[PDB]
Amino acid sequence: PLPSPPSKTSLDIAEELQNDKGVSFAFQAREEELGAFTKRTLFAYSGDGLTGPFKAPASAELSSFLTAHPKGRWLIAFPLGTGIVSVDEGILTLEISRSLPEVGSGSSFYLTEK
Amino acid sequence: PLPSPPSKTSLDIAEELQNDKGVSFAFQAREEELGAFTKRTLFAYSGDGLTGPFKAPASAELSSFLTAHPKGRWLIAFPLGTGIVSVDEGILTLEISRSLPEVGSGSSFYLTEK
Amino acid sequence: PLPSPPSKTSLDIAEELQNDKGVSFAFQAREEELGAFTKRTLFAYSGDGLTGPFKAPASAELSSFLTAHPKGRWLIAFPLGTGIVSVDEGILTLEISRSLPEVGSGSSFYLTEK
């Protein structure tokens, strides 16, 4: 009874990153298009604790997705703190508000008509 | 090996709202049906900071979706604070727990067998 | 222009749980497969407040999904506090960081290449 515009998933990729200390993250990058809008979502998960910023090489494809954000960085909520994800010259950085004894999972999206 | 009931997406719409001060939000309203259940999710994003409640006219369709919530309001977590979204006579209000230097993104859902 | 591996939703189920005091939760369990990766997401919603841990019998299927987590428990963010979901002998427990006047909604996922 309420109508919808057409929609599709135009990107859905995942990648595992690991830093020099053996901490590992999985990231998923998703793009949905719906009508005039595009939504890009970053999902992040680690089983590990994190005692400082997480830095690791990212693929060209993930790097492209991450750099597209209108602010060049992704504010992300995890259960025990906040992070910021950004990429520079193919290196992902996740900066954190506080040490995280468990990172858990979170997501960050932007949704635009541009 | 674990079975699922049938499911579908019965609604997926998005809309851009802007207040008198030039702050802009994108909202997405999604309905999933799975077996006996219906899940309605509100996604919200702004690149802007928010220095007080956000108020703006919403479409009839978005207003209908928002008013359906069993509490008549949507509790929503953003990375830096909490909000409540409600609608009255076609005007959306997002009230916030604290000033937000960046709103970022968040979602709020309800899931029911009714 | 950016390629994706194949993906599908391999599980999507929902269930309503109720404790001895009449508090009720809806849980949704979803599995996505994308390329090498599997993502398992638990969605949780209650309209009720919660004044202590929520305990209730869960189906064998939900119990199976919950026990699969690499930590045997799911750290979950709600708007007003944090929880941990686990299952033992078919009884779900949601432990909470603080009393919640409204639980609202939240989700917890893990994403792995195993």
Author numbering:
A (entry chain A), B (entry chain A), C (entry chain A): 232 to 345
Show the paper's wording.
The SnAdV-1 fibre head is the first Atadenovirus protein structure to be solved at atomic resolution. Despite the low sequence identity with other fibre heads, the topology of the beta-sandwich is identical to that of known adenovirus fibre head structures and contains ABCJ and GHID beta-sheets (the E- and F-strands in the long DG-loop of human adenoviruses 5 and 2 are absent). However, it is significantly more compact, making the 107-amino acid long SnAdV-1 fibre head the smallest adenoviral fibre head structure known.
The purified 171–345 construct protein crystallized in space group F23 after a period of about one year. After structure solution by molecular replacement, it was noted that density for residues 171–231 was absent. Coordinates and individual atom anisotropic temperature factors were refined at 1.33 Å resolution, leading to excellent agreement of the model with the data. The fact that density for residues 171–231 was absent even when maps were calculated using low-resolution reflections only, combined with the long lag-time before crystallization, indicates a possible proteolysis event during crystallization. Two other observations support this hypothesis. The first is that there is no room in the crystal lattice at the bottom of the head domain to accommodate a shaft domain; the second is that residues 232–234 point away from the three-fold trimer axis and away from each other, instead of downwards towards a potential shaft domain. The electron density for these residues is clear enough to make this interpretation reliable, while the low refinement R-factors suggests we are not missing a major part of the structure in our crystallographic model. B. Side view of A. There is not enough room for a shaft domain in the crystal packing; furthermore, the amino-terminal ends of the structure point away from each other and from the three-fold symmetry axis where the shaft domain is expected to be.
